[PDB]
Structure 1
Amino acid sequence: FPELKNDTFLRAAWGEETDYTPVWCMRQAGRYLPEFRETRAAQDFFSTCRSPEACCELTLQPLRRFPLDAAIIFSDILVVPQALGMEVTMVPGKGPSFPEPLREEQDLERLRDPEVVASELGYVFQAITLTRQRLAGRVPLIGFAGAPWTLMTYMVEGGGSSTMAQAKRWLYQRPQASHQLLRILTDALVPYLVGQVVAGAQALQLFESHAGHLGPQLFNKFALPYIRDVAKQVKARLREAGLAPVPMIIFAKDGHFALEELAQAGYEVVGLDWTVAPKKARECVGKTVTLQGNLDPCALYASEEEIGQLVKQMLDDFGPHRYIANLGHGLYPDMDPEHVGAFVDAVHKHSRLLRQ
């Protein structure tokens, strides 16, 4: 692989001082880019996903527009449940969905042995190697997957939900089968994530997007143990394979109650949503971890000038140490690329200014 030229993101992730605050955006490869829709029209989502060249191209697109300090592989968190044997249908404009979600304990029988998932996801590994080669060391490449509880919500709910009532019903009514499902997911994620690194990923992000539906008690029983197992086992397996561990990020959307624990869960970086105050997250996490975040994506609806001021206040609150700038959630498909540019520019400019 080519030698990394700009490694600011990795240094910040490992806790080291840098000359500026590195920045990237969740969903930087997304529908808000015109070129993204054009390329995705090659067929329909999961049917264009299967092509390494396609996923590479989508990954690179944002980097041609903005001087982002990292690329994230274009994929979907639903590829893991799919590789486990669930069928996904792609509703026209309505998003990826399981038309036959898991509904009772017996439905677990349909799933592949988690040990074979990595081999099902070879195309993803190929897309990572390719992207790493094509970036030619410009910036680091981030691999990613959904966290076990989050993946469970999708598998049980079938898709999106405002309550997660069906999923949490499993936690309360079917606690043993839930633990079994969560172990299967964990057992599949570990080889998938190690594979991403072997294929060329230089950092990993675990997305726990549906954390906030659980209170502290359910989260500690059913989400945390597996968040901890993923990091522990990924690290072990990489060490054994003679490879360098990579910085790992846990993002827990709506997870203010968990932050203190999430700082002790074996991850270099805790990613935050916009509902936690930066200084208060710093209290919860301590000095030992890097924070990432946390701009309200909707803030990008404001004027470039306003975006500039909002970024300045965000940076002032985080301080220059142990910080990777990002949004608090992915970019929405109706955002202006020029405003995304404004966000990237302002992080760079204000973080250098703050340093002086």
Structure 2
Amino acid sequence: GFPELKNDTFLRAAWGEETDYTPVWCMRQAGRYLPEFRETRAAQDFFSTCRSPEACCELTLQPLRRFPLDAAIIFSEILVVPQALGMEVTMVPGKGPSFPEPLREEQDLERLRDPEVVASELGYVFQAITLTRQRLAGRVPLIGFAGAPWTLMTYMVEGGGSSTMAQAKRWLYQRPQASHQLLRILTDALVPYLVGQVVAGAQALQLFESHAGHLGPQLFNKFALPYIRDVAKQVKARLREAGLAPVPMIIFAKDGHFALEELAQAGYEVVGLDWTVAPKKARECVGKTVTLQGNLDPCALYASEEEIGQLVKQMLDDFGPHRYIANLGHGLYPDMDPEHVGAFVDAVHKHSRLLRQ
């Protein structure tokens, strides 16, 4: 139903095969650092943008017109899942996401939709995925994505960003039962959503556990890890059952240094790394059979084009030329220079080829 893929380097590396060079992409490659992103986004409010296949497709394509990135990622939000479960969410400029009525007690779970119906509420995402895959015309693979259960829970309880997650963690300690219930609702919504993304055309999937860092090992193993594992097991199972090829799945646990061994056993092809983990230490944690993605400090792009090249060279030396996809350790920041993102991409390609030959 879709054009044949021309550059599959990203997929080959995700599965752990050898390639001629290291593939690269950037979290938030479609983002506010691009003037053209801001121009397209000035037309609608944020979630209206998410609900327009043409707008999502356009924002996805923009970075690919500037840089020879080895993957695209669909424009959407992780917060579409809580929204489709029935929570109201806003993204007013200057303030970040807010839920005006967060979940604060167990009884608040009653407001949520049955998780089995979330996928049908998210048809607009699938339309954006199909459109973008057709428009990409096989240039590079298209990544779909969602938030991990714990991270989604933090937003639902905290009502937005938090430096401590004190309310969400209070749920874990004081309301463990109701927490597991919410986390299971989330998992059961995520699975059919992620499956649907692949049915619509996604060629890989990333699960963002952006708030792993707040947990620590004991809480992470009890409350985050089981649902991370269940997402992967279930998504692969449903795809096989529907006659489709399962896709490479990436787990990105920001500030998750402490969980790398477990994440390596959690049924994901790729483990994404923040910039605080030394590549060689990550490699000792995860072993020889998963692919690593990352992990340059996004702020390194504030440095000169030449220094970026040298930092990239050092990073590639540490990861080595096997089982590795280059990216930053988090997303691009809004004040970053597009030319420096350009330099990061060119340096990965240049030094990875030098490192092989």
* TM-score class normalised by the smaller sequence: over 0.9
**TM norm structure 1:** 1.00
In structure 2, distance between residues paired with 1:48 and 1:256 = 35
Cα deviation digits, residues 93-123 of structure 1 (max 9, x gap): 2122111111110110110000000000000
In structure 2, distance between residues paired with 1:143 and 1:90 = 21
In structure 2, distance between residues paired with 1:194 and 1:90 = 27
Structure 1 residue 352, shift from structure 2 partner: 0.3
Match for residue 297 of structure 2?
296
Cα deviation digits, residues 55-90 of structure 1 (max 9, x gap): 000111000010000000011100000000000122
Cα deviation digits, residues 136-190 of structure 1 (max 9, x gap): 0000000000000000000000010000000000000000000000000000000
Match for residue 336 of structure 1?
337
Match for residue 326 of structure 1?
327
Q: Secondary structure at the match of 2:251?
A: strand
Instruction: After superposing the two structures, state which structure 1 stretch, 94-103 or 271-280, moved more.
Output: 94-103
In structure 1, distance between residues paired with 2:246 and 2:160 = 33
Does residue 283 of structure 2 align to residue 282 of structure 1?
yes
Does residue 110 of structure 2 align to residue 101 of structure 1?
no
Match for residue 352 of structure 1?
353
In structure 2, distance between residues paired with 1:56 and 1:123 = 12
In structure 2, distance between residues paired with 1:294 and 1:189 = 26
In structure 1, distance between residues paired with 2:99 and 2:78 = 13
Cα deviation digits, residues 238-259 of structure 1 (max 9, x gap): 0000000000000000001100
In structure 2, distance between residues paired with 1:90 and 1:22 = 32
Match for residue 67 of structure 2?
66
Cα deviation digits, residues 221-275 of structure 1 (max 9, x gap): 0000000000000000000000000000000000011000000000000000000
What percentage of residue pairs aligned between the two structures are identical?
100
Does residue 263 of structure 2 align to residue 262 of structure 1?
yes
In structure 2, distance between residues paired with 1:81 and 1:20 = 38
In structure 2, distance between residues paired with 1:241 and 1:322 = 29
Q: Secondary structure at the match of 2:205?
A: strand
Q: Secondary structure at the match of 2:133?
A: helix
Q: Secondary structure at the match of 1:292?
A: strand
In structure 2, distance between residues paired with 1:192 and 1:329 = 24
Cα deviation digits, residues 197-220 of structure 1 (max 9, x gap): 000000000000000000100000
Structure 1 residue 47, shift from structure 2 partner: 1.7
**TM norm structure 2:** 0.99
In structure 1, distance between residues paired with 2:35 and 2:18 = 36
Structure 1 residue 50, shift from structure 2 partner: 0.9
Structure 1 residue 42, shift from structure 2 partner: 1.0
Aligned residues: 356
Match for residue 14 of structure 1?
15
Q: Secondary structure at the match of 1:39?
A: helix
Where has structure 1 moved over 6 Å in runs of 4 or more? none
In structure 1, distance between residues paired with 2:27 and 2:316 = 18
Structure 1 residue 132, shift from structure 2 partner: 0.3
Instruction: After superposing the two structures, state which structure 1 stretch, 89-98 or 50-59, moved more.
Output: 89-98
Structure 1 residue 125, shift from structure 2 partner: 0.1
In structure 2, distance between residues paired with 1:31 and 1:212 = 25
Give ranges in structure 1 of 5+ residues lacking alignment.
none
Cα deviation digits, residues 13-62 of structure 1 (max 9, x gap): 00000000000000100000000011011121012211110000011100
In structure 1, distance between residues paired with 2:40 and 2:50 = 11
Match for residue 117 of structure 1?
118
Cα deviation digits, residues 291-332 of structure 1 (max 9, x gap): 000000000000000000000000000000000000000000
Instruction: After superposing the two structures, state which structure 1 stretch, 196-205 or 45-54, moved more.
Output: 45-54
Structure 1 residue 92, shift from structure 2 partner: 2.8
In structure 1, distance between residues paired with 2:81 and 2:307 = 39
Cα deviation digits, residues 328-347 of structure 1 (max 9, x gap): 00000110000000000000
Q: Secondary structure at the match of 1:324?
A: strand
In structure 2, distance between residues paired with 1:54 and 1:152 = 28
In structure 2, distance between residues paired with 1:311 and 1:61 = 24
In structure 2, distance between residues paired with 1:98 and 1:27 = 22
Q: Secondary structure at the match of 1:244?
A: coil
Instruction: After superposing the two structures, state which structure 1 stretch, 84-93 or 97-106, moved more.
Output: 84-93
Match for residue 189 of structure 1?
190
Match for residue 132 of structure 2?
131
Structure 1 residue 91, shift from structure 2 partner: 2.3
Q: Secondary structure at the match of 1:223?
A: helix
Q: Secondary structure at the match of 1:206?
A: strand
In structure 2, distance between residues paired with 1:17 and 1:46 = 40
In structure 1, distance between residues paired with 2:55 and 2:158 = 29
After superposition, the CA RMSD in angstroms is: 0.5
Structure 1 residue 196, shift from structure 2 partner: 0.2
